[PDB]
């Protein structure tokens, strides 16, 4: 349930409008999805979402489309289409370890997935995540 406050940090960074925050929050309370993956599209860039969120939830920062690698061994838990609406996907796979891309670390329902092996959460650019989603699973 906690982070160093999504929405608010994004507003402080000049990344979202006050309206993006509030409408997104209404959608959060209405749907169960949380504010972060909701702020985006309501005014927030996903890049901005992810950058602030990385600071907010204990995440190690991830790479661009020239960096992060797809792997069904880990990704077979979150479908490219779930990954797409979520904004998140597992990264690579060791027999004893998975690295994971988050979107919104507060999205209670979704952040509960991804970890398809002992694993660690990370976060960065949506460009990377989209290409990753579509190849990973």
């Amino acid at each position: 349930q906690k982070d160093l406050k999504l929405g608010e940090l994004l507003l402080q960074k000049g990344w979202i409008s006050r309206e993006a925050l509030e409408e997104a929050l209404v959608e959060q309370e209405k749907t169960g999805d949380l504010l972060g993956r909701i702020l985006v599209r309501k005014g927030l860039p996903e890049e901005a979402l992810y950058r602030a969120l990385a600071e907010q939830k204990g995440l190690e920062f991830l790479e661009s489309t020239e960096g992060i690698v797809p792997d069904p061994s880990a990704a077979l838990l979150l479908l490219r289409s779930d990954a797409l609406r979520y904004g998140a996907v597992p990264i690579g796979f060791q027999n004893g370890e998975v690295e994971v891309v988050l979107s919104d670390p507060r999205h209670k329902e979704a952040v509960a997935q991804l970890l398809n092996r002992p694993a660690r959460f990370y976060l960065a650019l949506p460009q990377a995540w989209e290409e990753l989603f579509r190849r990973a699973y």
Partner: protein
Amino acid sequence: LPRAKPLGEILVELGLARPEDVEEALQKQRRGGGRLEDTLVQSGKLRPEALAQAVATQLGYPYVDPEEDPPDPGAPLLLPEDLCRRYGVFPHRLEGNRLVLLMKDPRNILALDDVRLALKRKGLNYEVAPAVATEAAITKLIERFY
């Protein structure tokens, strides 16, 4: 270097400072001599996010959370706590010659130069790309490793 855009003006472009705050900091470069980047942090002409984001925007940097973003054991070996605290920095993951350096101001060349000599004399080839984080975590990263 680093160069690219000036920090002060970027703080403002982001909507995270007034040009008026940038100018007072510049007046500090005339009322003390620190450069715009030093004067902004010294004069408080940066919204916290302005500094961090503006530098991340100005030059190009990652957003991390140092509470968990790897405080590589080589990091306390690499840069000492006194220096680290004086310049608001602390190494994270060491990457061969390179470094993800936690830093309150990834552009401030003087702060970076004092850091550089320590990061040059120990561990790295400097090759530093400082990271963005809340000061609370910068404080904790420096504090916990020494």
